[PDB]
Amino acid sequence: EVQLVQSGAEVKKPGASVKVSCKASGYTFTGYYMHWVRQAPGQGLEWMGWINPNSGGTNYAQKFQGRVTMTRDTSITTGYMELSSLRSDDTALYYCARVGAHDYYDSSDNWFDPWGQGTLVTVFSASTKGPSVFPLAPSSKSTSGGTAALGCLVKDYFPEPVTVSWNSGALTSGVHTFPAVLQSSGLYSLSSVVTVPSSSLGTQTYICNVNHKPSNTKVDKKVEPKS
Amino acid sequence: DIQMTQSPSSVSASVGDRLTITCRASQGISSWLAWYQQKPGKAPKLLIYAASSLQSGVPSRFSGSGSGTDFTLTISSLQPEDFATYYCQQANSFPWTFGQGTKVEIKRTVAAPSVFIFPPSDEQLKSGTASVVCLLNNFYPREAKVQWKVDNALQSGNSQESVTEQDSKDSTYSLSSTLTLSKADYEKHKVYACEVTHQGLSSPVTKSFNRGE
Ligand SMILES: [Cl-]
Ligand SMILES: [Cl-]
Ligand SMILES: [Cl-]
C-alpha cells in the first residue's frame, strides 16, 4: 500500500516553530514530489509548497516564504515541514501529499494522491493536558428494544484532538464519536458511543482505545455492565 | 494567482438525485483541473483529474466536465456515503489553488431518536465530579430539544450538547447532552431525567434513573 503517515498533533506557543513529519512507504520515495497543504478552521485548503526529494529542491508559496522549510531524509523515506514564527492563524490541519510530476496534467500521477492523515497544530500558550477516560456502561437505562448503548467519556484534555477506536479497530459499525465540546475550563471533552445487541453483553468484550497524541496519552478502557 | 470560485457553497439533495457543482477559474486553465472529496474526519481524496478523467477505484457516478474557465462536478445518483465537502483545484500555475468547497448534505425521511441515559461512573465520582450523559441516537432532522430534570426540577446552565455529522450509511444525526455536577451536588438529589422532544416522536420521551440503583 502507498501511504503517507504523519506525526502527531502538537500545541506550540506563538513565536515558536513546529516540525511535522511525513513518513512515506510503499512507493519509490525519490520518484515523487511531496507537497504540503493546510486547512484552517473555515475548511479552506491552502497550498504551502513542495520538496523534490530527488534533488532536494523546494518551492514555497509566497505567503510562507521566509517562514517555512521543507526537507527530507531519503534513508528513512520521510519528509518534514517546519513552520517558524508561529502565529494564531497558523492553527490548522497540515497535510502532506504525493505528486508525481508538474508538467503533464493528463496523468493520474500528477495530482495530490495520496494524502497523509493530517497533523493538527494548535498555536496557543497553554500547556498540554491528557484526558481522563470513564466508562459509559450499558444498563437497563441504556437498552431500548433489544439494543444496548455503551461508550467512553473522554474528559479534560488540551489541545485537540483525541481519537477513539473500539476493540483496536475491529468494531466500527454503530460507533459515534462526537465532536469535542469546549468546557468553561478551557479544556475539551467528548464521548464515543456504540450500539450493540443487548443479548450478548455477557459474552462480548468492548474496549475503547483513546489516543491523545499531544500528551502521549494512550488509554484502553474496558466497558462492561455494572453489577 | 488563479482564483477558483465554487458554487453552490452548500446543497441539500436526496439519495438518487443528480447533483451538479460548478467551479470557475479566474483565467483559462485548459483541462488542468481536479476534483477532491473530503469526508468527515478524513483527508481529501482525488476523484477526477484533467477535468474529466476518473481516478482509479472511484465510483463512476462521480464525473467531471468542462474546459477553459467553467467546470462541473456531477454526481449522477447521490448516495448517503457522498455526504462530504467537494473541492476543485487548478494545477495550471503555481501556486496551486482550491475552490472554497461545496458541502453536500443528504435529505431523508424523518427518524425518531433512540434515547439512552448513563449515570456517572464510580471512577469519576471518586475524582469529585459527576457527568451524566444523555444519548439521542440516529434521528432526522437535526432539530431536537433536550431538557434535564433533577428531582423534577428543570435544569439550566450545567449541560453541553454535541451533534455528529450526518451518518455515512443512513444520513441520521446523533446527539449527546452531558450534565456536569460536583459529586456533592450529585449526591444531593435522587432522580436524574433526560426529556427528549423531536418531530419523529408522538410525545416527548423521558429516560431517567435513581442515583445508586
Ligand atoms: Cl467481543
Ligand atoms: Cl483567460
Ligand atoms: Cl463505574
Side-chain angles (χ1 to χ4, degrees), chain B residues 25-29 68-69:
Chain B
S26 56
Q27 61 182 256
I29 60 171
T69 62

Side-chain angles (χ1 to χ4, degrees), chain A residues 35 37 39 42-47 50 59 61-62 93 95 99 101-118 133-139 141-144 147-151 153 155 173-184 191 193-195 221 226, chain B residues 30-34 36 38 41-46 48-51 53 55-56 85 87 89-91 94-100 114-124 127 129 131 133 135-138 160-165 167 169 172-176 178 180 207-210:
Chain A
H35 290 233
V37 173
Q39 189 167 33
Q43 300 307 100
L45 295 163
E46 179 166 33
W47 178 79
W50 52 252
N59 185 34
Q62 190 53 243
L93 203 52
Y95 292 105
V99 178
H102 300 154
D103 45 356
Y104 287 94
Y105 67 86
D106 188 55
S107 173
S108 59
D109 296 342
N110 302 339
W111 302 89
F112 299 119
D113 181 55
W115 299 57
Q117 83 275 23
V133 181
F134 305 114
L136 298 166
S139 73
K141 308 309 163 66
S142 65
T143 49
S144 82
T147 74
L150 57 94
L153 173 63
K155 193 168 155 59
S173 180
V175 172
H176 297 298
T177 300
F178 287 90
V181 296
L182 180 64
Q183 308 174 104
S184 55
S191 283
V193 302
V194 57
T195 50
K221 175 119 289 181
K226 299 172 169 170
Chain B
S30 289
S31 297
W32 297 78
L33 187 286
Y36 299 84
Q38 188 176 37
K42 301 309 173 64
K45 163 194 174 190
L46 181 64
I48 300 292
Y49 63 95
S53 298
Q55 165 77 326
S56 296
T85 298
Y87 296 91
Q89 177 242 318
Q90 64 86 21
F94 288 104
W96 289 1
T97 48
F98 298 83
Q100 35 111 10
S114 307
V115 188
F116 311 85
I117 192 170
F118 302 94
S121 67
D122 289 326
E123 186 184 1
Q124 188 191 21
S127 74
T129 305
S131 295
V133 176
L135 167 65
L136 285 62
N137 208 42
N138 303 351
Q160 304 190 258
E161 287 182 3
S162 177
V163 64
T164 55
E165 72 277 16
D167 185 80
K169 290 199 226 296
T172 63
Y173 305 90
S174 297
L175 181 144
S176 72
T178 304
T180 302
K207 297 300 178 180
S208 66
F209 67 89
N210 289 14

Side-chain angles (χ1 to χ4, degrees), chain A residues 52-108:
Chain A
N52 183 322
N54 197 21
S55 65
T58 58
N59 185 34
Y60 308 133
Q62 190 53 243
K63 181 174 183 181
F64 305 105
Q65 183 70 48
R67 222 158 57 86
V68 68
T69 299
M70 291 169 188
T71 54
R72 50 82 166 96
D73 187 335
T74 292
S75 71
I76 57 168
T77 66
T78 299
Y80 308 91
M81 185 286 302
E82 182 164 37
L83 186 58
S84 302
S85 294
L86 289 169
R87 52 214 57 174
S88 188
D89 66 0
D90 290 324
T91 297
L93 203 52
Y94 288 83
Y95 292 105
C96 56
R98 188 186 70 162
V99 178
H102 300 154
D103 45 356
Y104 287 94
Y105 67 86
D106 188 55
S107 173
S108 59

